[PDB]
Structures are given as C-alpha cells and as structure tokens.
Design a protein around this ligand. Sequence first.
Ligand SMILES: Cc1cc2nc3c(=O)[nH]c(=O)nc-3n(C[C@H](O)[C@H](O)[C@H](O)COP(=O)(O)OP(=O)(O)OC[C@H]3O[C@@H](n4cnc5c(N)ncnc54)[C@H](O)[C@@H]3O)c2cc1C
Ligand SMILES: Cc1cc2nc3c(=O)[nH]c(=O)nc-3n(C[C@H](O)[C@H](O)[C@H](O)COP(=O)(O)OP(=O)(O)OC[C@H]3O[C@@H](n4cnc5c(N)ncnc54)[C@H](O)[C@@H]3O)c2cc1C
Ligand SMILES: *SCCNC(=O)CCNC(=O)[C@H](O)C(C)(C)COP(=O)(O)OP(=O)(O)OC[C@H]1O[C@@H](n2cnc3c(N)ncnc32)[C@H](O)[C@@H]1OP(=O)(O)O
Ligand SMILES: *SCCNC(=O)CCNC(=O)[C@H](O)C(C)(C)COP(=O)(O)OP(=O)(O)OC[C@H]1O[C@@H](n2cnc3c(N)ncnc32)[C@H](O)[C@@H]1OP(=O)(O)O
Ligand SMILES: CC1=CC(=O)c2ccccc2C1=O
Ligand SMILES: CC1=CC(=O)c2ccccc2C1=O
Lengths: 443, 443
Amino acid sequence: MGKRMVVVGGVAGGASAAAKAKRENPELEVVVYEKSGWVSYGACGLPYVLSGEIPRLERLVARTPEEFRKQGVLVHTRHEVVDVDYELRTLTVHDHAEGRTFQDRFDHLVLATGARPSLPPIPGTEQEGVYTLRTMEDGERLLKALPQARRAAILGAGYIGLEAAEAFRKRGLQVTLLEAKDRPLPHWDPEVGALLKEELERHGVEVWTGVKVEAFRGMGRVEAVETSEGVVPADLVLLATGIRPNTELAQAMGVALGPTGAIATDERMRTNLEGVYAAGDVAESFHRVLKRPYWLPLGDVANKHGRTAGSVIAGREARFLGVVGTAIFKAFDLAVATTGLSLEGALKEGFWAKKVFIQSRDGAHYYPGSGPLWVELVYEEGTGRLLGGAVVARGHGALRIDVLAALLHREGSVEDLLALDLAYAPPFSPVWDPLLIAAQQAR
Amino acid sequence: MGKRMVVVGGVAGGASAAAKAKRENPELEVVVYEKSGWVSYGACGLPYVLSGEIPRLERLVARTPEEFRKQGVLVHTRHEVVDVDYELRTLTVHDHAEGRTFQDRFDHLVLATGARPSLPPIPGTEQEGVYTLRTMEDGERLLKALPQARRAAILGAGYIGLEAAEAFRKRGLQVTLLEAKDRPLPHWDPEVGALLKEELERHGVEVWTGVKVEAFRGMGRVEAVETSEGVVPADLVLLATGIRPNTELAQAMGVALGPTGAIATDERMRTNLEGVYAAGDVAESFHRVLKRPYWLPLGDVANKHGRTAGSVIAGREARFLGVVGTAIFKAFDLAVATTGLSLEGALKEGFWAKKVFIQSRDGAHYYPGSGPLWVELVYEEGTGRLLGGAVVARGHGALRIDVLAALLHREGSVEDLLALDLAYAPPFSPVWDPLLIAAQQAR
Ligand SMILES: Cc1cc2nc3c(=O)[nH]c(=O)nc-3n(C[C@H](O)[C@H](O)[C@H](O)COP(=O)(O)OP(=O)(O)OC[C@H]3O[C@@H](n4cnc5c(N)ncnc54)[C@H](O)[C@@H]3O)c2cc1C
Ligand SMILES: Cc1cc2nc3c(=O)[nH]c(=O)nc-3n(C[C@H](O)[C@H](O)[C@H](O)COP(=O)(O)OP(=O)(O)OC[C@H]3O[C@@H](n4cnc5c(N)ncnc54)[C@H](O)[C@@H]3O)c2cc1C
Ligand SMILES: *SCCNC(=O)CCNC(=O)[C@H](O)C(C)(C)COP(=O)(O)OP(=O)(O)OC[C@H]1O[C@@H](n2cnc3c(N)ncnc32)[C@H](O)[C@@H]1OP(=O)(O)O
Ligand SMILES: *SCCNC(=O)CCNC(=O)[C@H](O)C(C)(C)COP(=O)(O)OP(=O)(O)OC[C@H]1O[C@@H](n2cnc3c(N)ncnc32)[C@H](O)[C@@H]1OP(=O)(O)O
Ligand SMILES: CC1=CC(=O)c2ccccc2C1=O
Ligand SMILES: CC1=CC(=O)c2ccccc2C1=O
C-alpha cells in the first residue's frame, strides 16, 4: 500500500532498512527515531578517529539527517521510543523529543536498537577516567581525554580492544591490556592469539593474560586497576568486555527472544509479531555451519538485515539466508580474519575435527617486501568438510578468508578448496596459494 | 615398481613433476633433461629483475641442480632430447650434452617442454635490438641492453608486455606500446583495458592502439618500427605477442594434440600413449565453465600439472580437475585480475550473457589511503549463472577474484555470490564488499 514504516534506532540496521524501503517503494512514509542524536555513522571507524589517522569524528557518518530528508526519509535524533502499543494494537510508539513527548502509529515496525556494552561487575566502574567505546558520544568523550595521555588500561582482548590498543599507542599512551582468559583473541584457536601477543608486545603494548580484575582505585577519578596479578597504574581505562543486545523495548511489546538472547527472526527478518521486523545487532542471524540461530553483531550483517527488512516492507522479494561467521580486524601490522568455527568450538559442537595451521608468504619467496601469511583450516576428520579457518596477513588484503567463507557457504570440503583455480603472481601469492598449501597438504 | 622417470623440460611443469615423484616414491630413478641450461626458475619474476626491483637474476630459481641432486633428482641442463623411440618401443630418448650425444630409456615419460614465443611475420625481426621475454637467457640479454636506455617499443599489450612496460619505465626508457587490437588487454572486456590505458599514460607510456606494424628499420641493428600510424623511434624492441606450445617433439613420437594445439591430456595427465604424460605449457587443461579442453599457460597451472603426473607416477592417487581461467598481473599501481569468460567471449559461446561493471573502494569511504576497486561480473541472463568476472585494485590483494573462481568452480550463480558472508572492516573493504554491491545490485 502507502503505509507508515517506523524504524527504532538508526545506526546501521535501522538506517539500512529505511533507506532501502523508501528507495524501493517511495509511497511509504518512512520515519526513524534515534536515541543517540547521531544516526548513520560507522562505529567501526572509531578506533581510527581516536588514533588521529582520521581528522574529525563527523567524517564517519554515511548520510546526514539532511540528506535523508532530501530523500524522503525523516529522521529524529535524540528521540527515544519509550513504549510500544503493539498487539495490544497499534497506537503504539510513545516517544520523547527535546522538551516534549508524543504518540505515533505504525503499519510497519523495524526494531534496530542495537546493542550496548556488557559491563562486568567491578567497583569503581562508575568513576571518571573509565570509558567505553561504542557510540559517537563515546567517541567525543575518549577523544577529549586522549591528549593529556598518559597511561591506559584496556580490559578485554577482543577485536575492539586490540583495535583500541593500536589506537591508544598511536596517541603516545603507554598501554597495558588485561584479559581474563589465557590468550589475546580468546575466542579463537590459540595460534592466532599467540601471533597477536607477539605483535602487541612488538609495539610496546604490555599484555597481562589470565587476570582477575578486582577493582578501579580512585576517589571518583581513577588511577589504578587493582588486579590479582598486581596493580596497574592508569589514568584512562576502557572497557572492551563484550556487548549485549538492546532488547528491553522489544520485550515490552512481547517480541520473542531467541536462544542467544537477541531478537528471534526468520529469513524475512520478521519477528513473531505481524508487521514487526528486527535488524542489526539486536538480531539473531542464522548460522549455516552450526545450522541454528546465532548472534553475529557485525556491521556488514546489520546492513544485510536492514536491507532485507526494508526490501520486504517495500514489497520486493528479499530474504536473508544466514551467516557463516566471517570477521576481520586490524591490529598494528597484522590483519586477522576468521570464519566459521574454530577447532576449539568445532569440538564443543562434537565434530571429529582436526585443525591445520601453516605459515606461507604473501608473494613469491624472491619478491621485494613480501610478508608472512598464515592460514588455518578447521575440518571434519572423516568427510573433510570445512568448518572454520583463519588467515592472518600484513595485507590490505588476504582476505583470502573470503574463499573459505565461500566454501563454508555451500558445504564445501578440503578436496574442493584443493581443486580451486586460484590467482598467482609474484607480488600477491607464492606459486601455491597459502590456502592451497594449507589444503590437506602439509601437517 | 622402481622404474625410470624421464622428464623432458624442467622449468616448472617438469621440475614440479620430478620433485613430487621422487618425494612420493624415492625408489624411482628420476632424471630431468633441460635444454636451456637453467632449471626450476620463475619466469614470472623476470619483469621484476629487468626493473631492478630484484638485484640478481639467480634470485628467481627455486631449486638448484645441486639441491635437486642432494634429493635424489638428477638434472642435466644444456641437454636436449632430439628424438624419442616411443611406441615404436622404448629405446627412446636420443639426446645431446656439451660435446656428446647419447641414448637413454624410460618407463615413465613426462613431456614439459613448455612454450615458445609466437613470432609475427615482420621483416627485420631477425635484427639486433629485437628481444623476447620468456627464458632466463632472454633475461640476461635484455639485462645487458637495458642500461644505455634509450627508447623502447613493445608489441602487444598482454599481461607480459604491460608488465614489461612497467619494467622498462622503471629503468628510465621512454616507452611506447604498440597493440593491433583496439585496447590494451584486448582479450578482455573493454572497461578493464580502458583503466589500463589511463594508468599507462599516467606513467609516461605512450599507447598506440589499432596499429599495423609494417617492419623494423635497421641495417642489422634496429632503430625504428615503421607502423601504419607512423614511425616510432626505438633502439630496443620487445615482442610480447603471445606464445604457442612446444609440441614438435611430442608429435614426433605420435602423442595426440588437442583442438588448442597443446598436448591432449586426461585428469591424470596421461597422454594417448601408455606411460607418457604431459605437464605445463605444452598441456591442455580442462576449462570448467567452457566444459572442454582449453590452453592456460600459467605457472600455477604448470605446477598443478607437474604435481599430478608426478604423484600418479609415484603411485599415489591424484587427479587434475581442471581450471576456470583465473589470472592476475601487476601493471604500475594497478593489480588486474580476471577469471572465467569475458562477456565478449561468453557471447561468442552463445550464452545470453550480461555484464555489470561497478567501481567501489578498497576500504571504508572514510579510511585513510583507501583506494578504488572495480569489479565486473559476467553472468547468464536467465539462470544467474556466473561465467566470468574481473576485479581491479591497487591492493596486494583484491585478489577478491579468488572468490569468483571459487563460485565458478561448482556452477555458482549471482544469487550464491549474494548470500556469501564476506569480511568487513574499515581498512579492507566498504561495508558492502565490492563483490556484493556488484552482485545484481547496481546496473
Ligand atoms: C569500536 C568498534 C569497532 C568495530 N569494528 C567493526 C569491524 O571492524 N567490522 C564489523 O563488521 N563491525 C564492527 N563493529 C560493529 C558495529 O558497530 C555493529 O555491529 C553495527 O554498527 C550494527 O548496528 P545496529 O543498527 O544493529 O545498532 P547499533 O549500532 O548498536 O545502534 C542502535 C542505536 O539505536 C539506539 N536505540 C537503542 N534503544 C532505543 C530505544 N528504546 N528507542 C530509540 N532508539 C534506541 C541506540 O542509542 C544506538 O546508538 C565495531 C563496533 C565498535 C563499537
Ligand atoms: C615474462 C613472463 C611473465 C610471466 N608472469 C606470470 C604471472 O604473473 N603469473 C603466472 O601464472 N604465470 C606467468 N608466466 C608464465 C610461466 O612462465 C609459464 O606458464 C610456466 O613457467 C610453465 O612452465 P613449463 O614447465 O610448462 O615450461 P616452460 O617454462 O616454457 O619451459 C620449458 C623449458 O624446457 C625446454 N625444452 C623445450 N623443448 C625441449 C626438448 N625437445 N628437449 C629438452 N628440453 C626442451 C625449453 O628450452 C624451456 O626453457 C610468465 C611468463 C613470462 C615469460
Ligand atoms: S612461473 C612460477 C612457477 N614455477 C616455478 O618455478 C615456481 C617454483 N616451482 C618449481 O620449480 C617447482 O615447484 C619445484 C620447487 C621444482 C618443486 O618443488 P616441490 O614439489 O618440492 O614443492 P615444495 O618443496 O615447495 O613443497 C612440497 C611440499 O611442501 C609443502 N609446503 C610448501 N610450502 C609450505 C609452507 N609454507 N608451510 C607448510 N608446508 C609447505 C607442500 O605442502 C608440499 O607437501 P607434500 O604434500 O609433501 O607435497
Ligand atoms: S559499522 C558500518 C555499517 N553501518 C554504517 O553506517 C555503514 C554505512 N551504512 C549505513 O548507515 C546505511 O547503509 C545507509 C548508508 C544509511 C543506507 O544506504 P543505502 O541503502 O542508500 O546505500 P547506498 O546508496 O550506499 O547503496 C544503495 C544502492 O547503491 C548501489 N551502489 C552502492 N555503491 C556503489 C558503487 N560503488 N557503484 C555502483 N553502485 C553502487 C547499491 O548497489 C545499492 O543498490 P540498490 O539495488 O539500488 O539498492
Ligand atoms: C615456499 C616456497 C617455495 C617455492 O618453491 C616458491 C616458488 C615461487 C614463489 C614462491 C615460493 C615459496 O614461497
Ligand atoms: C559508496 C559507499 C557507501 C557507504 O554507505 C559506505 C559505508 C561505509 C564504508 C564505505 C562506504 C562506501 O564506499
């Protein structure tokens, strides 16, 4: 028809959804209500702004509320949707401006409220040089504190967090990372974690492994971090201890949560309620190797979510077919790419799973400047089915991970990876592509 | 058993076979006869040595006749097998050393004699500044001529040749490329070729298109290149006008040629004669999009051919499943990768084929130093079947082509491409990988 789409949250799933919806069916009244007062910005670039590589923080926005308006889309920042009157039956949508508070109705609802820092229960968190990195505001805050170094503490060695320490080190602070688990990037096989310790340490970052963080010392300021392994002086600390999906609002209106705790969806991004979709980080995506719902709070998947809901509302045929887990991030001079399951995890799932980890180059043995390039392959013993792999490079690609993800997608195997006709030339690959050498091929 | 394997030609198909067979069954008597007096070197790197980027020419050999010996493998360079007494009945092998000339017998024969420059019929080629780039010796020659610039002409705008122009400009000569067809890289869709003219011109290479070269002017030296479009002063000229497989020896012995002119082989690399195999550039490979024999004189495929013959001979189970056409090469600040069919050629084959050519980036809009990145997609109208694609980057990878190859392998479609879970992060890719945007996705 010519109905009214309301998008709650407009960072990435939300923005995505609204832009595509309005493009595909211009007859729709498309409204976005955004709590944070910036909308359509890539958080994924925050470390690069902090580090100073990117001059001003506004350089992260993809579309401004102006451009949106100029394109049929009305966005309202610093608007919080407080209640939804659902089913029940759409009055729905009470929300709060600056000054006021009011009512709206919808015919289509997109929930794209995202996710918020999960905080470990530590005394002192509440204080003053303790920071989080997740929004534009966090950006501003952190960015103010940064000149005037002097010494930083990052709890958690996940992708953000490792990303963080680069940023920090580039700003001159002395940084020290505290992770609770035994390696950096604990969510993945230890080889990789190893490589990253080395590179962290190579660059001046101190890395405490297996640390229980007891509390943050300060009189409302902060200066310490007392830990089981001693006491780290620090005058800024960052919590990079994971996220959790913002589902409070969804549960108000009785939208069903899946096993992971994010909003349960179908291939159309629909929730359990007629006319209500979910998209981005408050959403479950379906994992194709695991063959079940799974949480994958990445930027690319938020965009896919959004675009499918939009498309579907706009009355196009569109379906989101699931994810396989592929991720990549940059810590210093390493580029770390994983996908699927790790061997650790392929085993939790009960496969009879072996891993292989090799180290090759990113160019012919003889070619100037050719780096190192490792690739892992996690596979099912009997069949040979791929289930996971990583590749790490210096390279602004490799990225070669994309192939694995490809093979993962349909249920490919090590035999298949072996058959592939890859690209060879002295600047970019040895004669046998790392992926190929890793295939069966060397133990 | 413990028979005798004779490898004619030991550049890459051959070397690969010898090393693999002797590793896999050390019982074998493995002998490699090689005409050129260098063996196991990478021709692929020659531009890099010509350019000065790589110091000495010997930096390109992968294994020395010494390391081979030390490993059970006896190589004899400067030895040319002049006849084979086959079937007939293996006396077989007459060949020529320094001084002498003798007999040998075989149980296993690998033909890996490769390819030679295909020479166009122009008067004055026979002369003195006219050079070819294929073997190490060509290396040496060219390497000698090169200081003492002054002005070069290259005939042909293929990969080598384009690669050659980079090389020559790097050594300071003024270079001017002559192609007969209308674009550089004429063997692909015109968008790519366009991209390359701009980049070669941007770097001081003059590119003549649609040129008929009439003769090379000189009194045994060379100084000109008379062409339809006028007269190019040149004191070194390079013929980069393609190659043709070295099959003379094989025909002698009554090995069947395929429709391409290369030696016809099966999935085990066996020729039509019992006990005789072929590897590398003298070999047809099976094109999996075209479903027929095809000729793909690349080095990564020679190694595949080589390893397969060797493994089969040594008595392991091995099969060569085919290629899909994947190629990559570097020309200045561009890295150009292709695969499958071009639209031009997908149409020659009679598919109802469309193309799509998009320009994206190699990293988020906002990320420092993010380059451009183009990608094309040649697909069948109905089905959505991928048939070909290209990608061009500055990047040391993207290399992203590897994905299309992957999809090309089983008969993957644009729908499949679209489902793929690719890696995102700001330094390496926009939030939609270029592959994905290109998928259906923008016209
Ligand atoms: C430092 C950092 C680095 C990252 N790097 C990468 C990377 O390299 N690669 C990658 O793929 N991903 C990366 N990500 C992840 C990425 O931020 C997310 O997965 C993505 O932005 C998804 O957005 P979304 O629209 O679901 O919601 P979110 O981005 O979580 O935002 C939703 C917004 O909606 C608002 N909202 C919440 N509740 C309400 C309510 N009740 N009413 C109205 N509005 C509300 C919130 O205030 C919030 O700011 C990174 C993230 C961070 C923080
Ligand atoms: C300048 C240049 C750049 C290149 N760049 C790339 C690239 O970027 N990527 C890529 O994949 N490929 C590239 N290649 C391709 C590559 O060189 C070949 O496809 C590869 O080396 C295959 O070798 P082969 O073993 O089949 O035989 P070849 O390498 O052609 O050599 C066979 C050798 O055996 C000898 N021989 C011939 N006849 C007889 C006989 N009757 N008796 C005894 N011995 C004999 C010959 O003298 C010859 O030197 C490039 C090639 C060149 C020349
Ligand atoms: S145009 C360029 C192509 N032609 C070239 O000349 C380039 C080099 N090619 C050659 O001349 C032949 O490939 C040679 C080197 C003569 C034959 O070499 P091998 O068959 O001996 O190959 P390798 O020794 O390189 O590898 C054989 C085994 O080594 C394993 N392997 C290689 N590299 C690694 C790394 N980085 N990590 C772990 N393992 C590695 C291969 O897996 C292979 O294993 P097998 O299963 O034992 O064959
Ligand atoms: S953590 C980072 C993820 N979140 C971000 O904020 C990153 C940016 N994302 C957004 O906020 C949303 O994606 C926005 C920008 C709000 C929604 O954007 P649109 O949905 O309008 O996206 P685009 O205009 O970028 O693309 C839409 C159509 O444009 C085509 N297209 C994109 N890029 C190219 C290039 N380089 N060449 C040709 N075409 C291109 C897409 O194909 C798309 O096609 P349709 O089929 O028309 O939708
Ligand atoms: C390990 C290794 C072995 C090679 O033979 C080789 C040949 C050509 C390019 C690169 C390589 C390489 O990295
Ligand atoms: C064209 C284009 C559009 C985006 O919305 C975008 C968003 C985040 C990173 C990169 C890009 C990009 O290159």
